[PDB]
Symmetry: C2
């Protein structure tokens, strides 16, 4: 379970969050730009959770 | 003068106006979409002016 959850967590989005996200969706015209809430703190907590899972 | 003005008028934008315009500019992020005021009436008047110039 640990290994599978870690693999899915890596596959979906990796191990970091970017401040700027490029979104291409049907309602949005052409290629729109969006921004995350607090990417750096979320990335830091991602790193702690990944380390805890590894340990 | 007639011929040169007609050639420039054709070269810059052609002889018709489209309701939807795709704009790519430095301030605008990615590729933005804009709309003209009254494209059909403007196109009709373009056709009259082109015909008058030709005559």
């Amino acid at each position: 379970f640990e290994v599978a959850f870690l693999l899915i967590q890596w596959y979906i989005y990796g191990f970091s969050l970017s401040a700027v996200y490029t979104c291409k969706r049907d309602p949005c015209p052409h290629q729109v730009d969006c921004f995350l809430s607090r990417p750096t703190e979320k990335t830091i907590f991602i790193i702690f959770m990944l380390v805890v899972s590894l340990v």
